[PDB]
Amino acid sequence: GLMQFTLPVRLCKEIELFHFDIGPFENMWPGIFVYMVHRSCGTSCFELEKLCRFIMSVKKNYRRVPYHNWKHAVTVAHCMYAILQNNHTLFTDLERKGLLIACLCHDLDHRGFSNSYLQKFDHPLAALYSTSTMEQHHFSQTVSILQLEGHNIFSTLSSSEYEQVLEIIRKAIIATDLALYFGNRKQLEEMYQTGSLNLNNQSHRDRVIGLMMTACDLCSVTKLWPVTKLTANDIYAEFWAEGDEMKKLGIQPIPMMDRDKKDEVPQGQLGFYNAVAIPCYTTLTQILPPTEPLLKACRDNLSQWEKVIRGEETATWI
Numbered sequence: 001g002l003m004q005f006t007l008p009v010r011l012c013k014e015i016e017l018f019h020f021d022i023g024p025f026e027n028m029w030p031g032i033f034v035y036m037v038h039r040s041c042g043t044s045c046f047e048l049e050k051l052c053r054f055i056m057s058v059k060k061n062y063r064r065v066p067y068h069n070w071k072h073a074v075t076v077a078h079c080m081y082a083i084l085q086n087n088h089t090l091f092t093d094l095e096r097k098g099l100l101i102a103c104l105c106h107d108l109d110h111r112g113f114s115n116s117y118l119q120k121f122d123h124p125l126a127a128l129y130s131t132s133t134m135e136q137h138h139f140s141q142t143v144s145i146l147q148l149e150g151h152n153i154f155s156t157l158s159s160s161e162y163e164q165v166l167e168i169i170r171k172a173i174i175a176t177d178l179a180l181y182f183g184n185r186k187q188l189e190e191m192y193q194t195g196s197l198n199l200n201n202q203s204h205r206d207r208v209i210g211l212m213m214t215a216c217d218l219c220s221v222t223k224l225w226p227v228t229k230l231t232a233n234d235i236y237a238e239f240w241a242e243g244d245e246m247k248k249l250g251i252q253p254i255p256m257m258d259r260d261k262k263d264e265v266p267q268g269q270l271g272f273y274n275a276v277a278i279p280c281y282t283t284l285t286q287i288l289p290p291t292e293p294l295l296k297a298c299r300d301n302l303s304q305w306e307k308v309i310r311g312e313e314t315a316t317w318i
């Protein structure tokens with residue numbers, strides 16, 4: 001009850017910053033998460049013993065893939081921590097509880113393959129869930145772990161608070177399907193500019209939490225350049241394996257996924273920053289001004305990719 005998590009000084013200070021990298025010591029990531037829950041939520045939010053058991057079953061259900069792994073889960077949860085700590089008074093008690101858990105669980109049992117690949121493969125999950133295929137699976141795995149004996153971290157909530165928090169987690173996890181992000185951001189753009197955006201309107205809060213989930217999910221493009229560049233390598237290791245799997249189904253993959261087209265990566269990163277990431281952090285920053293550092297860091301990384309194209313610097317891995 002009086003048992004705080006404390007980090008070394010460098011981490012205690014840098015964990016507050018948006019561009020924090022959780023480091024290469026896997027055994028420290030659970031304590032980093034619990035530190036963030038304790039400071040974001042309270043030391044009373046969860047029973048420590050149940051939270052620790054929950055965290056360790058979540059870790060076990062992330063696979064050893066290059067990018068959609070346990071390190072990504074914790075990284076996405078940290079970006080949510082930093083957004084919540086910079087916007088203290090905007091979010092409900094149930095939202096603080098739900099959203100860190102949503103981020104930790106948002107890619108549970110990811111196999112390193114896109115929704116597209118599962119549908120072309122004719123995977124059974126593509127018959128069970130016709131849209132947002134992996135994201136419905138991630139939510140389903142979250143509910144499974146929550147129902148394991150001793151894993152119910154929400155056990156002290158009323159029946160209606162429990163339904164509400166699981167509904168926050170379901171929408172937050174579904175929102176990480178980037179297919180849904182484009183229309184969500186367009187609507188948030190119109191709402192903000194015509195001045196109809198209303199944080200008391202539940203359907204408005206839902207849209208804003210969705211955009212927060214996209215922002216946290218993509219946050220590897222908001223790190224210092226050496227982190228972003230080395231993380232780009234991991235996500236392309238997945239993209240290229242999926243492309244290989246498309247060639248095995250007799251389908252030419254898109255270039256992003258074609259390892260014979262490594263030369264096209266710098267230009268593909270430009271399209272990704274201009275079409276997805278910069279617009280995401282731009283609209284986030286309009287709704288939640290204290291999240292501006294994410295936009296600034298994203299613009300810094302677009303500028304490094306522009307330098308890569310002008311040959312003023314390299315990748316190696318390209």
Ligand SMILES: O=C(Nc1nc(CN2CCCCC2)cs1)c1nc(C2CC2)cnc1Nc1cncnc1
Pocket residue numbers: 178217218220221228229231232235256268269271272275276
């Ligand atoms: O590059 C990415 N996606 C990419 N998408 C393309 C294709 N492009 C998209 C925009 C419009 C034109 C077509 C190229 S790279 C990417 N995607 C995700 C999620 C959407 C799956 C997460 N992180 C990504 N990159 C990254 C870079 N550096 C560090 N960490 C992550």
Ligand SMILES: [Mg+2]
Pocket residue numbers: 106107134176177
């Ligand atoms: Mg995902």
Ligand SMILES: [Zn+2]
Pocket residue numbers: 072076106107176217
């Ligand atoms: Zn993710």
